[PDB]
């Protein structure tokens, strides 16, 4: 057998792996160890990390709260403990480059909820956390992407709590943050991925609502262009590129009830981008029930999983 590339859905309820081509769904983990509020990343080498939540640390009188840091154990479908993130922040993003995992920006969980320009780095050889070169601006709710040992920071909200069209990139070899071309539409809490060597963004919150808009960025040319709008305005949409196909998954949308009420609603649906027609197409209404799920492309041995 060879591992198969699947959509991996992570939440407090467990981990579900979905093959969107066969429409087969598998239970990858029954563990609850991932905190509801979390972010996740998969390395090029298929290792899955999660950070989030909050807990009282054993050891620190000055800063008594830390955040969980976990790594998925492929042998027993449990989450392995790691040295915790010594920073009780939220609405941050996770990146990776060279032999480090990066926790980028965000805002403080407690008093005054300061927005952050700080970057915490987990050194995978030494097993220690520490501070890396700070961002050029404070930012939370942004998306972080990792490609060719660069770490991209896209959108979010800044020091005035307004949405950003900015994008910047970190090169750890040069210790250098650089500003890249901005998006057309400022957005936070949005979906983004690298796909066929370009960066694609979709949906998001804006300063006074939501957007369905999408855009595509050429890394080579440092230029944005419009991309097929997603069919619905949403917050916290996820994009996942899986063996050449772009998928859009979940997030919050507005339900109009029979009586005309406009109610926010959380979805775990999946759509695919039809490249030939340049259109989004529904795939499933609900992968599984979850709140606050994240989604990644992950290779797994299907014969070890429980079919659902």
Swiss-Prot record:
Compartments, as annotated in UniProt: Cytoplasm; Cytoplasm, Myofibril, Sarcomere, A band; Cytoplasm, Myofibril, Sarcomere, I band
Tissue-specificity statement: Highly expressed in fetal (19, 23 and 31 weeks of gestation) and adult skeletal muscle; expression levels tend to be higher in fetal compared to postnatal muscles (at protein level). Also expressed in fetal and adult heart.
Highest taxon above the source species: Eukaryota
Kelch repeats: 47-99, 100-149, 150-197, 199-244, 246-300
Disulfide bonds: none
Subunit and interaction comment: Component of the BCR(KLHL40) E3 ubiquitin ligase complex, at least composed of CUL3, KLHL40 and RBX1. Interacts with LMOD3.
Disease implication from the record: Nemaline myopathy 8: A severe form of nemaline myopathy. Nemaline myopathies are muscular disorders characterized by muscle weakness of varying severity and onset, and abnormal thread-like or rod-shaped structures in muscle fibers on histologic examination. NEM8 is characterized by fetal akinesia or hypokinesia, followed by contractures, fractures, respiratory failure, and swallowing difficulties apparent at birth. Most patients die in infancy. Skeletal muscle biopsy shows numerous small nemaline bodies, often with no normal myofibrils.
Function according to Swiss-Prot or TrEMBL: Substrate-specific adapter of a BCR (BTB-CUL3-RBX1) E3 ubiquitin ligase complex that acts as a key regulator of skeletal muscle development. The BCR(KLHL40) complex acts by mediating ubiquitination and degradation of TFDP1, thereby regulating the activity of the E2F:DP transcription factor complex. Promotes stabilization of LMOD3 by acting as a negative regulator of LMOD3 ubiquitination; the molecular process by which it negatively regulates ubiquitination of LMOD3 is however unclear.
Family: Belongs to the KLHL40 family.
Protein name in the entry: Kelch-like protein 40
Phylogenetic classification of the source organism: Eukaryota, Metazoa, Chordata, Craniata, Vertebrata
Full-sequence range covered: 314 to 621 of 621
